[PDB]
Amino acid sequence: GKAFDDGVFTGIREINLSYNKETAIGDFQVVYDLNGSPYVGENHKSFITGFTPVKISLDFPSEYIMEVSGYTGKVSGYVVVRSLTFKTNKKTYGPYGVTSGTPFSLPIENGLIVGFKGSIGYWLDYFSMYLSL
Amino acid sequence: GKAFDDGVFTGIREINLSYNKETAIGDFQVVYDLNGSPYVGENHKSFITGFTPVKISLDFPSEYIMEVSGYTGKVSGYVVVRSLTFKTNKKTYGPYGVTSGTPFSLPIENGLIVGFKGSIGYWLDYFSMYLSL
Amino acid sequence: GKAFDDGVFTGIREINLSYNKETAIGDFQVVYDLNGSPYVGENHKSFITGFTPVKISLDFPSEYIMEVSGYTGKVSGYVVVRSLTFKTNKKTYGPYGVTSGTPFSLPIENGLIVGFKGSIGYWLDYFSMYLSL
């Protein structure tokens, strides 16, 4: 897949992703906060079509992500991110995708997610998160 | 004067300032790095003219500021930033302005300058710096 | 359980834990690094006996934890940390305990674990980790 690295920002305003209930996460894009104004991150697109879009619009800054969870599993012989859930201090968004495979969970007790990196081929292969105070 | 606050970025690529050899620092602007791409900061301008511009073009990311020094003093009844010097790991830029009044110096043993804030009227009234690892 | 919170230090030198192959993790204690010298953390003990102790002595500072993983699950109606694994840049320590229930994984791409907190009753109920650059 095609590696991506958005880098670090001041916070998160919106997450735009796509998923297919038979495969995995496709598209991934983030509108960050940069010093009080939005910064629209690059759209990281799947090489394949047929995904369902979802917009996770956050009430920045009073609403922030406290947990990212999901599932990883095999799709056409590739280990990919099959499902994602975003839990904030105000609401739960998801699960989006297929809740099958091996679960993962990143709860945050102190600090914030300020960026994302990873790789997308036909699906979201992997991802990592930048954390900051 | 008018307060300004650029916020925090990933590093510094260029500093564009203006000064007068009889008064103090005038305009102040920074081209920041933002996750590997230039981010043109707003040009914070004096309400008067007659300054001399300087461009401090850093060889980013191998060159970075290790010490900021200068002088503060009274100009027409106002305490302002009269002079500035930027010392990097490669060379010294300045002094720019008038080396008179009270000196100040910020050497950095570990870390980086990642942002500026302050205020400008006829001259640079004051400034602060964001520091990060 | 009895809550504990070691707070933050400068690194990790040794982890002393105990487990039972039928239940979960029992005791937990850490020898931290505090500015180049060992700092012996308090022993956080189970309310019961019958656990198998293990010493994870790290070659500090060249050796450091890159991933913590494990399993959480029900023991006598309580959700507890059933197993732990500590992976360093040199070796994998574990799994210790019972690898049954729901897995969790914290890989660290950049940064270090500098502290632990949690709660222990008959078993380790929950835990969190302090992360720093």
Partner: peptide, 15 residues
């Protein structure tokens, strides 16, 4: 270098 750093957790998925 002159590049700011941040804590990074992950990756989750392939590798």
């Amino acid at each position: 270098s002159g590049i700011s750093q941040t804590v990074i957790v992950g990756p989750w998925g392939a590798q």
